[PDB]
Amino acid sequence: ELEKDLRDALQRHELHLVYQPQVDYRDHRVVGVEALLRWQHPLHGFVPPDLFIPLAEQNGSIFSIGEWVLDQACRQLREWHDQGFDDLRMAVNLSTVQLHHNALPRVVSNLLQVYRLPARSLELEVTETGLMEDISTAAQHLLSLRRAGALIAIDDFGTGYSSLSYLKSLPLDKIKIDKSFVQDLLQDEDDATIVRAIIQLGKSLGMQVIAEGVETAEQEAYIIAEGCNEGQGYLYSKPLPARELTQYLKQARRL
Amino acid sequence: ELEKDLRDALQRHELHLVYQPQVDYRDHRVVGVEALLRWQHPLHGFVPPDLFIPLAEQNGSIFSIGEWVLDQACRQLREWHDQGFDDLRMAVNLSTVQLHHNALPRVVSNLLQVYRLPARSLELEVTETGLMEDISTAAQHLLSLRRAGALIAIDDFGTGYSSLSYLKSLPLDKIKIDKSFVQDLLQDEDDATIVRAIIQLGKSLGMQVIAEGVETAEQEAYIIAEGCNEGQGYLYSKPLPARELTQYLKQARR
Ligand SMILES: [Mg+2]
Ligand SMILES: [Mg+2]
Structure with missing residues (x-):
C-alpha cells in the first residue's frame, strides 16, 4: 500500500530532490533555493x-x-558556491519528528563543517505545528541549530497556531506566508488582509517575510507594494531538478 | 477547604464586582467599563x-x-445608562468553561433583553486559550453572541496561541494587549516590540486594540503614537466599587 513501498524507496533510489528559487525584491536577484x-x-x-x-x-x-x-542539499549548495554563487542560501524543511529528535543538532553541525558552508547559508524551515507539540524541546534544538550557523524560518505561516511571545523569543529569522493566502491574493480580500497582516507582523518583529505561491506579476506587484521582502513560486520557477536549476541560476546571475 | 468554601461563596455573598474604566484615544473620553x-x-x-x-x-x-x-454587570449598565451615561459599554470576562457551555448564548441574550440594553453595549472578553480549547464550538457560540447584539474581545492577547486565519474569520471586534507587555513597556524593549506588533496586527486585521495596564503618561504617549485605540489601567483608574466609579463618570462628564 506504499506504506510498505516507502520502505524500499531510498534504497531503490526513488526519492530525489527538486529545488525552487527565491527572489529578493530589493534587487530582484535569486538569493536562495528551497530543497x-x-x-x-x-x-x-x-x-x-x-x-x-x-x-x-x-x-x-x-x-x-x-x-x-x-x-x-548541503552538497548541492557547496557545488553552487564553488560555481561562483557563494552568497546563495539553501532551505530545507524539517518535519515535526525531526525537529524534536535530539540528534538533529549533531547532524546539521556535521554537514556545515563537512561542506565548509558559510554562516547563515543553511536555513531550516519548521511549521507552527512542529513548534507547538513541545515548545520547550523545539526551543532548545532551534537555539542549538542557530548556534551552529543555521538560520531558522517558519513555513506555512498563518495555517497553524502561534504565540507572539514565542515568535519573538525564538531564534527565528524569516516567516514564509502560506501559499494558500498568496495564490488567491487578487480574489479574496480576507486572504489579502491576512497576507498584509503577516507582512506587517514580520516587519513589526524584525523578521524577513517571503511570499510562497507567487504565480503572477500582478501578485508580485501587490506584495511588493505592501512591503514583502522575498518571493517564491511558479512566477519565478516551478521546482526543478538540480541540473535544470543550475542553468536557471547561471542565467539569472548572468547579467 | 478553599475549594470547599468556594462551593457556597455565592449564597454567602462573598463575591462582589469592581469596575475599571476604559478610555478611547480618538477623543480621550471614557467609553467603557470592565466588570x-x-x-x-x-x-x-x-x-x-x-x-x-x-x-x-x-x-x-x-x-x-x-x-x-x-x-x-448588565444591571449596573442599565443604571448608568439611566443616569445619563447613555453610550457606555460594559465588558465581562468569560472563562473557557463558560465560553463552551451550551447555555451561554441563551444566558447572555436573556439579560440583554431583561435589562433592555442597546446593541453593542455588552462586550464579552475571551482568551486565546478558551478559543483553542474547541475552535468549532467557540465559533458557533461567538456567532450566536454577536447575533444577539454582544461584542467580542480577545483578552490577555499575546500570552496564548492564536491563528491569524481564525482571528480574521471569527466575529471579533477587539484585541486587548496583555498587561504584562504594557507594564514592561518603557524599560523593556522586546515587550515594546510585542506591543508594537500587537497594535499593528490589530490595524492589519481591522480590529480595535486596547492596551491594558497603562500606568504612566509616557506609556500612553508611546502606544497612541503606534496606533492604539483605547487604554485601561491605573493611569485612568484602578478598579473601583460601583459607587466610586459612578463618582468617576459624573466627575468627567461635567
Ligand atoms: Mg518549505
Ligand atoms: Mg478582561
Missing part, C-alpha cells in the same frame, strides 16, 4: 509529501530520510 | 481570580457565578 523532497514511484507517479512524510514519521524512518535530504 | 470579579473571604481575605476561577471551573461553580456576574 523539496519527491518520491516518484515507477508504478504510482509522484506520492505527495503530505502523504508519505506522515508515513515516515510513524515508522521511524523520517530521521534517516531527513539525514539524506540534508546531506544532498 | 471584574472579586472574592473577599472573611478568613482568607481576597482570593486571587487566577486561583479561584480555575477552581470554579473544576468544581462546576463557574456557571452560576458567571451568570451572577453577567446579571449584576
Whole structure:
C-alpha cells in the first residue's frame, strides 16, 4: 500500500530532490533555493509529501530520510558556491519528528563543517505545528541549530497556531506566508488582509517575510507594494531538478 | 477547604464586582467599563481570580457565578445608562468553561433583553486559550453572541496561541494587549516590540486594540503614537466599587 513501498524507496533510489528559487525584491536577484523532497514511484507517479512524510514519521524512518535530504542539499549548495554563487542560501524543511529528535543538532553541525558552508547559508524551515507539540524541546534544538550557523524560518505561516511571545523569543529569522493566502491574493480580500497582516507582523518583529505561491506579476506587484521582502513560486520557477536549476541560476546571475 | 468554601461563596455573598474604566484615544473620553470579579473571604481575605476561577471551573461553580456576574454587570449598565451615561459599554470576562457551555448564548441574550440594553453595549472578553480549547464550538457560540447584539474581545492577547486565519474569520471586534507587555513597556524593549506588533496586527486585521495596564503618561504617549485605540489601567483608574466609579463618570462628564 506504499506504506510498505516507502520502505524500499531510498534504497531503490526513488526519492530525489527538486529545488525552487527565491527572489529578493530589493534587487530582484535569486538569493536562495528551497530543497523539496519527491518520491516518484515507477508504478504510482509522484506520492505527495503530505502523504508519505506522515508515513515516515510513524515508522521511524523520517530521521534517516531527513539525514539524506540534508546531506544532498548541503552538497548541492557547496557545488553552487564553488560555481561562483557563494552568497546563495539553501532551505530545507524539517518535519515535526525531526525537529524534536535530539540528534538533529549533531547532524546539521556535521554537514556545515563537512561542506565548509558559510554562516547563515543553511536555513531550516519548521511549521507552527512542529513548534507547538513541545515548545520547550523545539526551543532548545532551534537555539542549538542557530548556534551552529543555521538560520531558522517558519513555513506555512498563518495555517497553524502561534504565540507572539514565542515568535519573538525564538531564534527565528524569516516567516514564509502560506501559499494558500498568496495564490488567491487578487480574489479574496480576507486572504489579502491576512497576507498584509503577516507582512506587517514580520516587519513589526524584525523578521524577513517571503511570499510562497507567487504565480503572477500582478501578485508580485501587490506584495511588493505592501512591503514583502522575498518571493517564491511558479512566477519565478516551478521546482526543478538540480541540473535544470543550475542553468536557471547561471542565467539569472548572468547579467 | 478553599475549594470547599468556594462551593457556597455565592449564597454567602462573598463575591462582589469592581469596575475599571476604559478610555478611547480618538477623543480621550471614557467609553467603557470592565466588570471584574472579586472574592473577599472573611478568613482568607481576597482570593486571587487566577486561583479561584480555575477552581470554579473544576468544581462546576463557574456557571452560576458567571451568570451572577453577567446579571449584576448588565444591571449596573442599565443604571448608568439611566443616569445619563447613555453610550457606555460594559465588558465581562468569560472563562473557557463558560465560553463552551451550551447555555451561554441563551444566558447572555436573556439579560440583554431583561435589562433592555442597546446593541453593542455588552462586550464579552475571551482568551486565546478558551478559543483553542474547541475552535468549532467557540465559533458557533461567538456567532450566536454577536447575533444577539454582544461584542467580542480577545483578552490577555499575546500570552496564548492564536491563528491569524481564525482571528480574521471569527466575529471579533477587539484585541486587548496583555498587561504584562504594557507594564514592561518603557524599560523593556522586546515587550515594546510585542506591543508594537500587537497594535499593528490589530490595524492589519481591522480590529480595535486596547492596551491594558497603562500606568504612566509616557506609556500612553508611546502606544497612541503606534496606533492604539483605547487604554485601561491605573493611569485612568484602578478598579473601583460601583459607587466610586459612578463618582468617576459624573466627575468627567461635567
Ligand atoms: Mg518549505
Ligand atoms: Mg478582561
